[PDB]
Amino acid sequence: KSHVVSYRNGPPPHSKATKIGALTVGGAMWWWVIWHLWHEPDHITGEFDYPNSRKWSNT
Amino acid sequence: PPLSLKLINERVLLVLKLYDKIDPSKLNVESHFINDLGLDSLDHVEVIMAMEDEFGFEIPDSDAEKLLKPADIIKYVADKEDVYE
Amino acid sequence: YFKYNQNDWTRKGGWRVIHSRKQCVPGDEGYPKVSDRSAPSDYAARGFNESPL
Amino acid sequence: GWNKDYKPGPYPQTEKERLAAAKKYYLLPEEYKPYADDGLGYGDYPKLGYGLGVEAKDSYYPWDYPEHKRNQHEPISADHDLYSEDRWSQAEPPRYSNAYYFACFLGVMSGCLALYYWLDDKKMYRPVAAKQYPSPGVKHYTFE
Amino acid sequence: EPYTVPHASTYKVESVPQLVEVKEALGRQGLKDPWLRNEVWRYEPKAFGTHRSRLNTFLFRGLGVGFCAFLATVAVEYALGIGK
Amino acid sequence: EEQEFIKRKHEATLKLRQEFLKQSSNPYRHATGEGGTVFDAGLARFQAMRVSNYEHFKPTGKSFRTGLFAVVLPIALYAWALKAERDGREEKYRTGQVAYKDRQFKFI
Amino acid sequence: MKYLSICSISFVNLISMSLSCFLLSLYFLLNDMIYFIEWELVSLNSMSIVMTFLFDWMSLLFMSFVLMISSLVIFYSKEYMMNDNHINRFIMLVLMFVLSMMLLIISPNLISILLGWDGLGLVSYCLVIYFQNIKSYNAGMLTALSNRIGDVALLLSIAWMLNYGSWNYIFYLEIMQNEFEMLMIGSLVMLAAMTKSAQIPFSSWLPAAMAAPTPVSALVHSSTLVTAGVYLLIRFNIILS
Amino acid sequence: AQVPLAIVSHKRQVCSLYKRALRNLESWYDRRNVYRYRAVQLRARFDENRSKDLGEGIRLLACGQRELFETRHFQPRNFANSAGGCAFEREVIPPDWVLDYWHPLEKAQYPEYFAKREQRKKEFVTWWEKQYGK
Amino acid sequence: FLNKSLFMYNLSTFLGSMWFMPYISTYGMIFYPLNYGQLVVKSFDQGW
Amino acid sequence: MLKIIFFLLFLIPFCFINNMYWMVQIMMFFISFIFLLMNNFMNYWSEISYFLGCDMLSYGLILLSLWICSLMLLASEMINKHNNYKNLFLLNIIILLLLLILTFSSMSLFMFYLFFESSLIPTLFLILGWGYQPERLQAGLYLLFYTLLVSLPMLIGIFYLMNKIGSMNFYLMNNFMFNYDLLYFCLLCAFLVKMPMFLVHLWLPKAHVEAPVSGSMILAGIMLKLGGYGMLRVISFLQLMNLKYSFVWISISLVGGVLVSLVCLRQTDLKALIAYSSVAHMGIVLSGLLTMTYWGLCGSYTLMIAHGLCSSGLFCLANVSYERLGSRSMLINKGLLNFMPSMTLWWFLLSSANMAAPPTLNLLGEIYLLNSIVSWSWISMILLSFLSFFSAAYTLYLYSFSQHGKLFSGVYSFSSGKIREYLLMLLHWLPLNLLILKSESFMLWL
Amino acid sequence: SMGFLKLAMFHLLTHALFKALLFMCAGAIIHNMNNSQDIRLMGGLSIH
Amino acid sequence: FSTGLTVSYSFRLVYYSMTGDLNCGSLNMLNDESWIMLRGMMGLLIMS
Amino acid sequence: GNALTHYMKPDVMPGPDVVPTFDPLLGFKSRKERVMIATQEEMESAKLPLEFRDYCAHLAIAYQACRSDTFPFVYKCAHQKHEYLTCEYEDYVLRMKEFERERRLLERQKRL
Amino acid sequence: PRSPMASFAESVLNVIDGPITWFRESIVEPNQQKQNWYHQRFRRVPTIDQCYTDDAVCRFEADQQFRRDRMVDNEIVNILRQRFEDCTLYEAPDHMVKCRPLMDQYEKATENWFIKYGDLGGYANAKTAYMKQKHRLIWERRHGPVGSGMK
Amino acid sequence: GHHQMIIKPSRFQWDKFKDLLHFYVMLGVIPVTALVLYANIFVGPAQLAEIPEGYEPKHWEYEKHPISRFISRYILNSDQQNYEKSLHYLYEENEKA
């Protein structure tokens, strides 16, 4: 099935390259998330202010 | 990976040494449940139930009654998994 | 086969084709473009508006 | 033999025929129980099975033909299909009764449906004005 | 040989992570637990660490790289000429 | 436990288990390679009853009511509904109520 | 399929095809074109039975993503089926899904849809019944019958769609909205979309999408029967709203 | 080989009841720390009434069975690689005579296997002759 | 602690069984047509 | 058409000459190829020989008859294995072939009826001379006497038509119209038995079950279609009387359709499933036909043709099992995917065509017929939906249970798939895909 | 049902993409367990 | 209401199978190296 | 500022998508008229769908030029989007102000 | 060529059009013989009205004329449909621009086509069609416009 | 590599079947492909046009394509042939009746 099958133990400590693969996979997600966040943080907010019906004086 | 007959033996031995309510020293590998282990009416199926969880399959309800020894358990696991060889 | 043997007004039961017109863009040749399908004869031409007789 | 050779006999009407038929089908004298033979019956054919389901039968028993959980010579039920695991049958008693399953479904459906239509009568919205369209003769007034 | 098995001398029901506590919260009932020795290799230190630590490991796997690479990109858009 | 009902079945019914094995493992008729299957009474019984039960059918109240409500009333009611609706629709048509504009299925 | 893994064989042509489709989708978007190529079969009583393929940015993009995911799914299967018999059987079935999906998506005519629709069901049963465990029997057989109910609704819908002189729906919806016939033509289309889209009370078979190999589960949920079901509806906007 | 009788003793009707109960704990409680607690709490419930009259045992089944049936997890922990599993019985293999009907060129890929296959076949014939003296 | 599943066993069972649709679409509709067919052949196809 | 007729007569001697099973086979396919080449017809009668014509309606029917009649010899070879009077078999087939050609080309009603009912004999030879079940006797009694008991009475209607008309060419009847209310039933019902109708389906399952691969293929492949072909030619002048009394026939067909499909679900025999299935499809054909609308009729012609093809192929499948595992039962036959997986492909395909999966000339039918019926009466839809639904339902069951479950324990070694059967299955299906390209010849005949 | 096609198709493909990826994730996990498919059986896989 | 549920059962699964205790047997059947089962995932992952 | 009060006073709350009904009152807002920029002929060739073929279309065709110009990287075409949605946003302000204007003009005569 | 990919799509359009049009000019024009194929002109026939009570050949001639005329008028409905089809495809906003001005031709065509041929079903020959017109003329004269019931 | 056999039925007959199919079909296709390529490229399509008032096409004039030209003139009886066929035959039958 799989070439690594331990017994009553954690995973057989795998190579750094595979560790590097995972960390970068999560890192790319984060990089882009903050990338968008700073580039357009206003989007989560309504892009336009919300004026008030009462505040609108009767001309 | 395949399964090794000696390791099946040591593994049932490991859980048996692990099981408290059995005679702690785990007397002769062929310890009958009602003789020296003293395993009661209900203690017997507690043995089978742990063996189940350990070996990844249910034992049949009556066929547990066929299992009357740790030698039987190895013998039942062996018949399942082609361990004779 | 789509350039020379389309399903025209002569042969029928082949792949008859039909399309919509491109999207103009401000600054384009003939930007304010007029409808080309002048008359209903234009619709369903199938090569018959270009008949030999 | 052929089918006409194997055709089941008429319903047994005295105890000796019951003994014979049970042997004809390899059944024990009490195991054999012919259908009611009331006007749409097979007659001497035994009435077996008809339980909750075939898969209710033993999972691990030594079966000659596991396919249908069947040993060798044994009278196949007249309704083997309609009770086979591939057809209407289960392994364990149901939790509730038929009305429960249908009621729990449909009662909820009717109520939620009707309560929706009541609320469609009051369809909320954002208080905004009607969408303006340029057109001949239309002269909406700018706030100016 | 596929793998290896220890002797089970190591498997002590005295596993520290609140298996003794449930032993106590049983002790008020005071019945027993004969199989509990199995859960020793189960909840063992440095196998999986703390659940909160595991969540830290998971929910934040590359945030540091993300922020660093983020700051580099910030410097690029600041000095490369994009400006604001 | 009936005092050995399970047992009494047990003796004979476990004999033919071995004969099934003998048949299945039979090197000789498997060597003939002509196909076919070890005979099975339940199968033979089942086919014969499946093909023939009219000789058992007694035309009584049960069977009559069963068949009547099985197809007959279905056939009669459905046919009557079809004829009735068509009679109405065609009646409108031959009266000319609906002109050659409203009507549907102009092309079958 | 004699010297190289079938996974390689299909994978490469799949990635090649859909990138071409993707780029053509852009062309359609920058020009906003809609082609409606048509090849007629027969015509009686003034009706024209026609195999039609409509090409628009929507369909092209849709089949594009469907088919990169197809390529990546089969590549994953290259290992998940590492030790299985009938791998080749499994893979050609996957292609039949993809081909049947192409036709169903592009179909702008009710008849062309019907080709792909039961075609999806036709292979849907195959790759659900792939294993030989009784659950797969039950699971696939339920799904196939659920889908068949949908196909029947389309098949009935053909009957009333005859009224408006063709089966090219996207050119009659607007002009004849309110009519009773178009009303119910949407109704039958509505029902068929429910069945493939596993809408309640028909949401009883997507749970039975689980007996198939998780590659199949991926390509049955990613963009498959259910998605094509709603994709029939997006093609039919007018009457629904 | 022996196929067992179906007779059952009240001990078994009560112990296999304990077995199903342990299962029903699993399907309703998962965390092994939580489990062993409640499983041993279950044991006390099977221990406080250890030895009672037969009649009370019958009423004890009259309650015990209902508890399982009325408290059965709607999704029992059906076992992975056993009967009823989520992927068990995935494929089947046909009887060996299918290998017997390979085309001679098809036979020509594993001669060593087929040679030994031929030998074992005759030795099986001897074995079956023994099986009941033919 | 208290397991809310057992707190609302019936509702959870309903909620957990997908509103009992699988029973509806499997047990609640196949019993009759199959009996209907065998009923019918015993009445007309082969009887009356 | 005398070209074909004389070809068949000069093929007859080969039956006597020894070892001509395969030479005859190639010739029958070759003449089918020749008859393919001869194709220019319109609605009018064409190729008017002494009394033989040909037309859209007759041209395709003849091609199917020549097609299927050649495929017999591929299907049946156990006759050669057994040396079970191969000469009588070949002679019986050719005699049947000639009768079909003359039936479908008889421009006179009486000539048509004459060959139509002359075919009673050679088919009966085919079942009886090579049957297997002991039921073969009573089955032959059912087949022959259900037919003759109504097929004879139209003989009066034919002569009555002569007296009031003066001839029996088809165009001549069309000019007139009769409404005496017995002429209608006497002709209609007489054809309905051979159609067959659900209420007189009774014989047909028996005939198929206890008949060889060949006879069953003939029975379901032409005989039912031949009844329908007569209907198409004859209802031209039964219109008014038909209109008054038509709801009964359409009702029983549609009602019987869902019923017989439920019989299929509960049935437990490969030939029984297909036999009942073939009755179901011919139920819908009878419905669209009796609608008499253009869509119904032009579609009926198509569905008869496609149904004949699919029914044949499914019978070859049933023969395959019957010839390996030696038992027709659902129970014995199972899991064949493990023993003939490349064959199970063909099992699926032929099943597919029978449930109207495209590209399939069958499917092309139901669009036409369903449009006709729906237009004729909206009420039909409530049963049309279920009719098709259960149609596909049993076909699913047939395909799955036969090919899917775990194998049967007691099964004695049987040879594997072979070129004859493989080529046989392609030949029945592949034309069933071919025709859609040029349905216009198989789609337009009115 | 409201009648907004663009968001439907936009979300349709979006829905399609990552869920396929999730199906891939599950497939990786399921094989890497002994052919079992229960969330209860699984636990911390991040370390592995 | 369903949107909260989407996050709900999502995180519900997250804790059980993936940050909770490893409700497994004795065999540690877990592997991670397999590149193909990843590399097929990666392209979609990037696009997602 | 919600919609539930409609069910209590189905009169007082104007309703959805409602046209003005007191615009003759010019003593308040709405004394000037609309303004048309993008001619319907150019709009026709613009292929702008009718659902949007409204007063905010001049910028719409402007954007189409932006996107048809530098299509491969639409992200560059940002400011054209920024302005267009703003021009729409101002229309939305008018939409609200129309709603409350007809609300105002309703209220001053309600009890009278 | 403002847009980049459109300035590239043209490049593949030059790629695709290149060899084909070269092939057309290279291995067709130097290898084509000139031949002509015309189009039928079937003479009119004495229709059913003209022919006698029992003139089977004449009646057969009339029906064939009726069938061919049916097949054409059968068609003219289709072409008008195809024509309307193009218009609805013309432009996304352009539906009401020319739907009614163009469709109504198709509408009239259908109703006229129905009146002449519709409601007869298959097997319908010139006789049943012709007399149906006679019946309709009688109805129009007696009971007034069809679509009013009777008086 | 570490191959552990699998019980599999024979694939030979099925594989041979495909091979015969591919073989014979290409056999028939090749001359067919040659013939169609020849006519269309050596001759190609006759062009539609008007009637020369003094002319009268023979029935083979009315098909555009050459392979149709060959088929219709040589192999299929003219429509006008199969027209008079009926007119003759219906004349006798009406008279006889």
Question: Can you tell me the distance from the alpha carbon of J292 to that of J295, in angstroms, rounded to the nearest whole number?
Answer: 8
- The B residues from 31 to 60 touching H (CB cutoff 8 Å) are 41-42, 44-45, 48-49, 56-58
Contact O50 C52 (CB under 8 A): yes
Question: For residue J385, which residues of chain G lie inside 8 Å, CB to CB?
Answer: 152-153, 156
Question: Can you tell me the distance from the alpha carbon of H84 to that of J93, in angstroms, rounded to the nearest whole number?
Answer: 53
Contact E58 L20 (CB under 8 A): no
Three-state DSSP at J192 gives helix
Q: Do chains K and L touch (3 or more CB pairs under 8 A)?
A: yes
Q: How many CA atoms lie within 13 A of D25 on its CB side?
A: 30
Question: For residue M49, which residues of chain N lie inside 8 Å, CB to CB?
Answer: 92-93
DSSP annotation of N36 = E
Contact J40 O13 (CB under 8 A): no
The H or E element spanning position N74 is helix N56-90
**O80: contact with N, CB 8 A cutoff:** no
DSSP string computed for chain L: -HHHHHHHHHHHHHHHHHHS-----SEE------HHHHHHHHHHHHH-
Question: Can you tell me the distance from the alpha carbon of J267 to that of F50, in angstroms, rounded to the nearest whole number?
Answer: 9
Contact J245, F27 (CB under 8 A): no
Question: For residue H75, which residues of chain I lie inside 8 Å, CB to CB?
Answer: 16
Contact G137, J404 (CB under 8 A): yes
Question: Can you tell me the distance from the alpha carbon of N131 to that of N135, in angstroms, rounded to the nearest whole number?
Answer: 6
Contact D3, F48 (CB under 8 A): yes
- The J residues from 90 to 129 touching G (CB cutoff 8 Å) are none
Question: Can you tell me the distance from the alpha carbon of J426 to that of J313, in angstroms, rounded to the nearest whole number?
Answer: 9
Scored b (16 or more CB within 10 A) or e, M22-33 reads ebeeeeebbeee
C-alpha pair distances (Å), G37 with each of C2, G21, G107? 10, 17, 11
| One-letter identity of residue B44 | H
CA O49 to chain centre: 25
**L23: contact with A, CB 8 A cutoff:** no
CA N126 to chain centre: 20
Question: Can you tell me the distance from the alpha carbon of J273 to that of J263, in angstroms, rounded to the nearest whole number?
Answer: 8
Contact E43 L21 (CB under 8 A): yes
C-alpha pair distances (Å), F27 with each of F31, H94, H129, J161? 6, 17, 10, 69
Alpha-carbon dihedral sign for residues J101, J103, J107, J108: positive
**N149: contact with F, CB 8 A cutoff:** yes
DSSP string computed for H115-132: HHHHHHHHHHHHHHHHHH
Q: Can you list the alpha helix ranges (DSSP code H) found in J355-380?
A: 361-376
Q: Length of chain J in residues, anyone?
A: 446
C-alpha pair distances (Å), H129 with each of F16, F26, G187, J322, M42? 18, 10, 71, 31, 98
DSSP annotation of O60 = G
| Other residues' Cβ atoms within 10 Å of the Cβ of residue L9 | 9
DSSP string computed for A25-53: HHHHHHHHHHHHHHHSGGGTS-SS----T
The H or E element spanning position G41 is strand G35-42
CB pairs under 8 A between F and H: 20
Q: Residue J52 — φ and ψ, nearest 5°?
A: -110, 130
| Other residues' Cβ atoms within 10 Å of the Cβ of residue I33 | 20
Contact G184, G164 (CB under 8 A): no
Token reading at J324: 């390996």
Q: Determined by which method?
A: cryo-EM
CA J384 to chain centre: 22
Contact N5 G27 (CB under 8 A): yes
| One-letter identity of residue J382 | I
Q: How many CA atoms lie within 13 A of G48 on its CB side?
A: 23
Question: Can you tell me the distance from the alpha carbon of L26 to that of I20, in angstroms, rounded to the nearest whole number?
Answer: 36
Contact J430, J42 (CB under 8 A): no
Q: Can you list the alpha helix ranges (DSSP code H) found in chain G?
A: 6-31, 57-80, 87-106, 110-128, 134-161, 180-196, 214-221, 225-235
CA G64 to chain centre: 13
Question: Can you tell me the distance from the alpha carbon of M94 to that of M96, in angstroms, rounded to the nearest whole number?
Answer: 5
Contact G98, G186 (CB under 8 A): no
Three-state DSSP at G168 gives strand
Question: Can you tell me the distance from the alpha carbon of G8 to that of H98, in angstroms, rounded to the nearest whole number?
Answer: 31
Q: How many CA atoms lie within 13 A of J220 on its CB side?
A: 36
Three-state DSSP at E10 gives coil
E strand spans, J216-340: none
Question: Can you tell me the distance from the alpha carbon of D31 to that of J193, in angstroms, rounded to the nearest whole number?
Answer: 45
- The L residues from 5 to 34 touching K (CB cutoff 8 Å) are 13, 16-25, 27, 29-32, 34
Task: Tell me whether strands A6-7 and L27-28 are parallel, antiparallel or unpaired.
Answer: antiparallel
Of C7, C18, C22, the CB nearest to G36: C18
Three-state DSSP at M18 gives coil
Three-state DSSP at G120 gives helix
Q: Residue N37 — φ and ψ, nearest 5°?
A: -140, 120
What distance separates the 2 farthest-apart alpha carbons in chain G?
60
Q: Which residues contact J370 (CB under 8 A, 6 or more apart)?
A: G155, G156, G158, G159, J384, J388
Scored b (16 or more CB within 10 A) or e, N42-80 reads eeebebbeebeeebbbbbbbbbbbbbebbeeebeebbbb
| Other residues' Cβ atoms within 10 Å of the Cβ of residue N87 | 22
Question: Can you tell me the distance from the alpha carbon of G178 to that of J287, in angstroms, rounded to the nearest whole number?
Answer: 32
- Packing angle of the helix pair H32-45, E19-27 (nearest 10 deg): 20
Our CA-based measurement puts residue H34 at a distance from the nearest CA of chain I, in whole angstroms, of 10
Token reading at I3: 């397991």
Q: Is N18 exposed, middle or buried (0-12, 13-18, 19+ CB in 10 A)?
A: exposed
Nearest to M84 by CA among M39, M49, M52: M52
The H or E element spanning position O47 is strand O47-48
The H or E element spanning position G52 is strand G49-55
Scored b (16 or more CB within 10 A) or e, G34-69 reads bebbbebbbbbbbbbbbbbbbbbbbbbbbbbbbbbb
Q: Which residues pair with A6 in a beta bridge?
A: L28
DSSP string computed for N89-127: HH-SS-STTTHHHHHHHHHHHHHHHHHHHTT--TT--HH
Q: Which residues contact N72 (CB under 8 A, 6 or more apart)?
A: none
The residue in chain F having the minimum alpha-carbon distance to the alpha carbon of residue D4 is F48
Three-state DSSP at A6 gives strand
Task: Tell me whether strands L27-28 and N36-37 are parallel, antiparallel or unpaired.
Answer: unpaired
Question: Can you tell me the distance from the alpha carbon of G100 to that of J357, in angstroms, rounded to the nearest whole number?
Answer: 12
Of H77, H81, H85, the CB nearest to K40: H77
Nearest to J400 by CA among J363, J328, J352, J342: J352
Our CA-based measurement puts residue H121 at a distance from the nearest CA of chain J, in whole angstroms, of 15
Q: Which residues pair with F64 in a beta bridge?
A: none
Our CA-based measurement puts residue F80 at a distance from the nearest CA of chain D, in whole angstroms, of 29
Alpha-carbon dihedral sign for residues J419, J421, J426, J428: positive
First to last CA, chain K: 44
| Other residues' Cβ atoms within 10 Å of the Cβ of residue K39 | 16
Tally of helices (H runs) and strands (E runs) in chain N: 4, 1
| One-letter identity of residue J415 | S
Question: Can you tell me the distance from the alpha carbon of O31 to that of E3, in angstroms, rounded to the nearest whole number?
Answer: 67
DSSP annotation of C35 = P
Token reading at K19: 């869920």
The H or E element spanning position G42 is strand G35-42
- Packing angle of the helix pair G57-80, K5-32 (nearest 10 deg): 0
Contact G159, J381 (CB under 8 A): yes
Question: Can you tell me the distance from the alpha carbon of G175 to that of F9, in angstroms, rounded to the nearest whole number?
Answer: 77
- Enumerate neighbours of M (3 or more CB pairs within 8 A): A, C, D, G, N
| Other residues' Cβ atoms within 10 Å of the Cβ of residue J290 | 25
Question: For residue G215, which residues of chain H lie inside 8 Å, CB to CB?
Answer: none
Scored b (16 or more CB within 10 A) or e, J346-377 reads bbbbbbbbbbbbbbbbbbbbbbbbbbbbbbbb
Contact G76 L36 (CB under 8 A): yes
Question: For residue O68, which residues of chain N lie inside 8 Å, CB to CB?
Answer: none
Token reading at B18: 């692990």
Our CA-based measurement puts residue F42 at a distance from the nearest CA of chain H, in whole angstroms, of 21
Q: How many CA atoms lie within 13 A of G173 on its CB side?
A: 18
B40 is catalytic: yes
- Which of B40, B53, B63, B79 is flagged as catalytic? B40
**I36: contact with J, CB 8 A cutoff:** yes
